[PDB]
């Protein structure tokens, strides 16, 4: 990984030590990016619902993961499952149980810094993985992209700024998650998020992290080329809100 400071350094060190799983996959790879394109063609708003027991954002919600997943199966384009343990209270067992319970695409959201974590995602039933430009050297990012692609996954590449985008495009990203998160305030910079979206080629599938969980924001972004939306706290708090977001 890159050399880091603070809690990202900590979580990367934890991740490097994470024991791998041994399990045979007995679930198809259900492509998230393709399902998003399908929703776009059908004019159905495509929302990727997070399951996250905790978040550094103040998030502290206990709710049954299977009940949540089965509810979202009806509405969401896919699920994003936090599997990082220390800051998000995630677990591989929770991912496995969720994957064994629904047949919509599942993104394993963690801090992937070694190949065996991609093996873990595959073996546990996830359909793809998050890769984070800001924690990986360029060579690592390219290699891990290729390694995920070796399983038939297309990873979601997380960018937070223009430097991350330059790297992501150079290494061949085709599925990009645009955050533009400030870690002091914990707020999405909407202006910058929009600038980044405008800089992405038309042949990249684009997912925006939503801070403001409202229909009008979705409509503006969709107009600007965004294909799908990641939404976390508001859906963990009130799952049924997704219905009003998709109309
Ligand atoms: C989960 C709700 C968000 C998450 O897992 C995550 C990971 C890494 C990351 C890096 C950023 O900048 C480099 C911004 C946001 C973010 C969110
Ligand atoms: C999504 C609207 C917020 C999100 O993904 C996120 C991820 C990680 C993170 C870390 C923080 O501490 C450094 C603060 C906020 C925050 C928000």
Domain coverage including residue 80:
1-247
Ligand 1, atom 8: closest residue by C-alpha: 132
Domain of 225: which CATH number?
A: 3.20.20.70
**What technique solved it?**
X-ray
Residues 6+ apart with CB under 8 A from 52: 59, 61, 82, 88, 90, 109, 232, 236
Ligand 1 centre distance from Cα of residue 203 (Å): 24
Q: Confirm or reject: Cβ of 158 under 6 Å from ligand 1.
A: yes
Structural domain count, the chain: 1
Quoted resolution (Å): 1.4
Q: Confirm or reject: Cβ of 182 under 6 Å from ligand 2.
A: no
Ligand 1 centre distance from Cα of residue 65 (Å): 21
Ligand 2 centre distance from Cα of residue 57 (Å): 5
Q: Confirm or reject: Cβ of 8 under 6 Å from ligand 2.
A: no
Convert the chain into a string of H (helix), E (strand) and C (coil).
Answer: CCCCCHHHHHHHHHHHCCCCCCCCCCCCCCCHHHHHHHHHHCCCCCEEEEECCECCCCCECCCCHHHHHHHHHCCCCEEEEECCCCCCCCCHHHHHHHHCCCCCCEEEECCCCCHHHHHHHHHHCCCEEEEEHHHCCHHHHHHHHHHHHCCCCCCEEEECCHHHHHHHHHCCCCEEEECCECCCCCCECHHHHHHHHHCCCCCCEEEEECCCCCHHHHHHHHHCCCCEEEECHHHHHCCCHHHHHHC
């Amino acid at each position: 990984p890159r050399y880091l400071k603070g809690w990202l350094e900590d979580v990367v060190q934890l991740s490097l030590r994470r024991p791998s799983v041994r399990a045979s996959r007995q679930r198809p790879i259900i492509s998230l990016n393709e399902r998003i394109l399908e929703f776009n063609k059908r004019n159905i708003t495509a929302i990727i619902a997070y399951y996250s027991r905790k978040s550094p954002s103040g998030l502290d919600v206990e709710r049954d993961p299977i009940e949540y997943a089965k509810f979202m199966e009806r509405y969401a384009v896919g699920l994003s499952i936090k599997t990082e343990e220390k800051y998000f209270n995630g677990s591989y067992e929770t991912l496995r149980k969720i994957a064994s319970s629904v047949s919509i695409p599942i993104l394993m959201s963690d801090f992937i810094v070694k190949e065996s974590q991609i093996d873990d995602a595959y073996n546990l039933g996830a359909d793809t993985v998050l890769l984070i430009v800001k924690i990986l050297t360029e060579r690592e990012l390219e290699s891990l992209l290729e390694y995920a692609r070796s399983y038939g996954m297309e990873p979601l590449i997380l960018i937070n700024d223009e430097n991350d985008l330059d790297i992501a495009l150079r290494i061949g990203a085709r599925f990009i998650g645009i955050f533009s998160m400030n870690f002091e305030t914990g707020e999405i910079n909407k202006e910058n998020q929009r600038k980044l979206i405008s800089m992405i080629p038309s042949n990249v599938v684009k997912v925006a992290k939503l801070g403001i969980s409202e229909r009008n924001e979705i409509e503006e972004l969709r107009k600007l080329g965004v294909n799908a939306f990641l939404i976390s706290s508001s859906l963990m708090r009130n799952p049924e809100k997704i219905k009003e977001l998709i109309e």
